[PDB]
Amino acid sequence: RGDIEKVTHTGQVFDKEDYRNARFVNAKRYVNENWGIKLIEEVPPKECTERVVFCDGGDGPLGHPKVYINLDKPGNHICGYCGLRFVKK
Amino acid sequence: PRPLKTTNPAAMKRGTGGRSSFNGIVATVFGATGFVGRYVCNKLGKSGTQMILPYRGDDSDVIRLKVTGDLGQVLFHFYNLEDPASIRDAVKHSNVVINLVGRDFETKNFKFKDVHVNGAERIARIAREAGVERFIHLSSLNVEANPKDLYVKGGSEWLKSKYEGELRVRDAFPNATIIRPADIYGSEDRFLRYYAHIWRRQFRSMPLWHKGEKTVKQPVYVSDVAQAIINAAKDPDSAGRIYQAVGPKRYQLSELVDWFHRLMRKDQKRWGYMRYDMRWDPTFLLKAKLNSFICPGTPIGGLHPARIEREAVTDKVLTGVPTLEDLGVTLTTMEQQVPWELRPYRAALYYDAELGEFETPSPPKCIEARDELRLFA
Amino acid sequence: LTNKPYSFVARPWEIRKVSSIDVLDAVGSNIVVSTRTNEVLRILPRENEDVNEEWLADKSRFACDGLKRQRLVAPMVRMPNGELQAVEWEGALIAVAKAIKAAGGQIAGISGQLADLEAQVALKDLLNRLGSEVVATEQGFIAGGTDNRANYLLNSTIAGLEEADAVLLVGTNPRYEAPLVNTRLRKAYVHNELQIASIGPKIDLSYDHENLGADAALVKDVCSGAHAFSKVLEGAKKPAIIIGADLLERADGAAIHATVAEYCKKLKKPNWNPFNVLQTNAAQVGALDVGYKAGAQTAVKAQPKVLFLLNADAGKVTREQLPKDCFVVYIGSHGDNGASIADAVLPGAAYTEKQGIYVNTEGRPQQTLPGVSPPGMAREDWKILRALSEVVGKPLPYDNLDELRNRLEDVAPHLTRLGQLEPAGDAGAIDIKLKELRDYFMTDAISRASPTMAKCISAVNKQQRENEAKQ
Amino acid sequence: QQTLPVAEVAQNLPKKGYSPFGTKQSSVAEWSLARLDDLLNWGRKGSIWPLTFGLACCAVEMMHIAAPRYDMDRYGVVFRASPRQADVIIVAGTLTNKMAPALRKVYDQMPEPRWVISMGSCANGGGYYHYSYSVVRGCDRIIPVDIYVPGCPPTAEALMYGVLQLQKKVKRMKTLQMWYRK
Amino acid sequence: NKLSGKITVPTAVNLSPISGVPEEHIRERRVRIHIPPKNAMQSGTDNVNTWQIEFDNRERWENPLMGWASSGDPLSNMNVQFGSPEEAITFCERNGWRWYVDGAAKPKKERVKNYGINFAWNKRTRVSTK
Amino acid sequence: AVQQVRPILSVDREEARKRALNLYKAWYRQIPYIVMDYDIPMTVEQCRDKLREEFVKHRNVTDIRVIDMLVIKGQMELKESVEIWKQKGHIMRYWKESQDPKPTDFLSKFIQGV
């Protein structure tokens, strides 16, 4: 069965000869289908003008605490909390 | 230098001993819902061992075994002896397998052959293909290549099947450990329930072959058998070695039954125990035959004739064949165990007579080698 | 600013603190191993200003990851195929006891550098039962001068180093041989006008130092007192002369030591012994106080049929260099290259996992504490030897740590007065390793085992390449 | 993990049958034994009699279920006091060491087929007192638990939902049908 | 000839049997009287003014099921505080344990810590920057 | 190193033995009743034997006060067994039959882990 084959995004598969496989002979090995790494990758990097932007990730008090991210560096800048991505250029 | 099988530290022995310390043993226990399965599994759980407990009855029959281990230590796997696919699945990840399968009587879905030898070899072949390090089997101590009945003609099939099971299991598995007990006495046991149950008794006159005075029995206690199983499972150097599992002191069936009835308070004034000759009375056999023919499940009190032949058969040990002492297992004697064991069945506290002050049941007396040679002349 | 490796891993409230001592350098700095659920997450300095100074080098700080990779987790025995398959403790020790008994009483034991004194003493006692006194240490030392305690220590009281006034480092780079000692000197250089000369090759001590050359003839002329810095040494009130143990094992250096001790006679000021020896391994001083020989080649020259190796993963011994028939047993934790050349490989619990006694450079003995359960079948080193003895049939008397700690008390009461330092009084070209950080990071098996150190080596090499190419 | 079918899939599918065994039996004996199991399970399912052990805090919910808001005798459930006449035991509250032998004794004095519901966290895994010197960590270590009702306490709805889940387990139990194979 | 039945008895009364601790722990475990270590990246020091005792680590494996940190060793978390080591040794004896003190530290030697040295005409201690 | 302190019960070591042996009387005399009352495997001789060893459990008690308390515990446990407050599990507790005597010699310890 594929359930006990899938690689958890955390990065675990029971070895092919590992007795802890036995626990799934009769129950499914739940593995989630949304991997945050892929999803945030898909989200495009927002861009702004000001040297310093602010993110709360979510909205109002439904997101993470307000954080200010400077963009003067050439590259992207990833929000510490939500993983949103910023680029000033 | 004994090699190792796995190099994954998660799959490797650890802990301080107990319900949590994983012992590096993963076992399937075929026939776990039995007289000896309970004792084996409880011992294995005490070690902190992973169990797979295959079962063919309703899981409710086995749910009690869940109490024997910490979380995830016990899994129940529905199978059937007639489904090799299921057995393969049950043994793939296993490290050891124990074959506690086998009835005392015959069924409608199984004749002694198909359940007692043909099934066993299938299990062993599947186990061997699965690459299972250790395999264990049980075979009665009285096993003979050419059984001869003693009182009733068609009553030695169990013995024939037992020999067949041993040889073919050894054929299909290079080095399995075939432990060999006989007449294991314990709680919820064929042995003591049989000698206690009513149908076994006539009016007040237990019928015994040759008055039970031409029989030598050496029963052993169930836990000591179980404790042997685990100790020989932990050790792989026991592999490929039969073991005659017997108790400390042989006995004469007359000594036992009299002591039993003394323990049960069955002999004070009125209950009036007597011992017949089973040959004299021709009624006991009919009871067995009818009781077999009528009961759909296990016959009442295990009265089927095969049990009757078993009591008749003597217990022939042999030297060289290793023993429990070789397995490092101390053996609680009957004198320590049986009194408490039969305490539930004590009865007969008449108003007409005296009680309480009756002495503690004076124990029985063993039978020595020359004294045996007197018995058999 | 925060640890890149110990990043996001655990919170201080969750974690558990275990006092301990660093072992990767002979400073023996005090450590607080920050364990959480059988995982050594990080390392912190424990304030012991007599020794530790509350700082801590990068090696001790970051190499903790080395204790999670290349670990030995199963006894192994070399088959006719030769692959060293995994086996169990029964067969392993029984096989080892077989070889020892039938080898023919020609045995040696070479102690590595991460072996605690208990492992040394257990090793020695067993081999004295077997009748073999060939018990060497990897890092060789003075011939015929190993007897007076002050010949292999920092008699100058590492705390007292900061009090030093004129320091002479003969080819002994502290900045990569004892960084904690180095910063103590810099504190002197900043607060007491420490006159720091050098009689070795080029190095940088993070501060000015007078380089008088490299040739070993310079130490002799100075010891006679024929050079300007020698006059400075004379005029000082706390002179110190530091000689690196490598040089003392280089070659014909016992003469160098003898002259150095000769001059220290006059330099001695009351309550102050100038002579200084920056030990490198954390077990060398342990070896001296138990009475080993020095020099792995010494043990090879004995021509033993069997060999013992307390986690001795230095290349100083190679089976080619060994007798061909020499049976080889390795009793160490990390499966490093030196472990790779043994026919029997017994796992061992690393220093954080085992309770042992380490004599630091200056000489105080200090006790590690176990913070993490060892992996696999790994056991304590002094337990492996004890089991093997009783398997052979020459049992040692010490079945418990205290029994063993009393056996050490017999050998050296000074050596069990933990936390104290008994005084020893009187004491008795040049090219050196670890003259650059690139040399420094890769020193020991744990160091090579660690992933972060490997990243550090690459990062420094790349910045150098930038200097070449960014140009 | 699986998920319910969608509207059109339901449209294709037929009635889900009543006896969970189904109606695919081959021979007369099979078909007959299927019905007798169905009748037995129907009896044991419709009428179930808790023992009302109810040690603590959880017990209050064990009473609210008897209360008239989420009526339980509506389902055929009655609180018989005597364990000889009680068919099910809702162990609820903490199991202290003084109680452990008592629970064991009460359990096996009850005749089978006996099912145990471990209500509340205190019984499930020792709950909030798990690291205590006097509490049985869980009740799995004394008796064979059948259904776990998480909660502290479980809201009454949760408890009697679990009861229905026990009814489903009582519905699908195979005793005669599979004795035939035995 | 009495003061409400007062008696003369030795001050050091071992209480191992009355205590209730199993002899296994008493006979295989030590105690490590010390002062709790000062956290490296802190600066307040009002949690290392007490003398503390605890018991050596025994073992920790991981639960096969869920990969927790199982531990079948009771006195693993045990931790008690005292005002002075001699008090703790007195306590530890009365409960019949094996112990070995761990000397905390000598009194801090005064450091001059002058401000002017940052700016000196001759001494090396002139600060490079501010 | 002496302290002038209160008593509990016994003022001299001999009174302590007098109290201690009184307890031994109650326990010896009780054993048969518990064999009857408590349906447990144990027999009179074994119960008597354990009672002997369990006093030997602490032979080298010295302080008058400590031995007094040990007796105080015993008088309690006596009453809890005299009357049947205890349970068959509780009374058997003195044997510790659930766990096998763990290995003791160094190899068995070594080969079976810490």
Ligand SMILES: NC(=O)C1=CN([C@@H]2O[C@H](COP(=O)(O)OP(=O)(O)OC[C@H]3O[C@@H](n4cnc5c(N)ncnc54)[C@H](OP(=O)(O)O)[C@@H]3O)[C@@H](O)[C@H]2O)C=CC1
């Ligand atoms: N006094 C004795 O019984 C003796 C014991 N032995 C041997 O030891 C073993 C254990 O003895 P004991 O427990 O008393 O015997 P039991 O009659 O109690 O058998 C116990 C187990 O055997 C299982 N069993 C029987 N037939 C089958 C089958 N076709 N398929 C699957 N399981 C089956 C049963 O499964 P389920 O209950 O679920 O139907 C049961 O769980 C036996 O095999 C016996 O040969 C040897 C000497 C004497």
Ligand code: SF4
């Ligand atoms: S689980 Fe919650 S509701 Fe139930 S007894 Fe415990 S604390 Fe009370």
Ligand SMILES: [Zn+2]
């Ligand atoms: Zn954000």
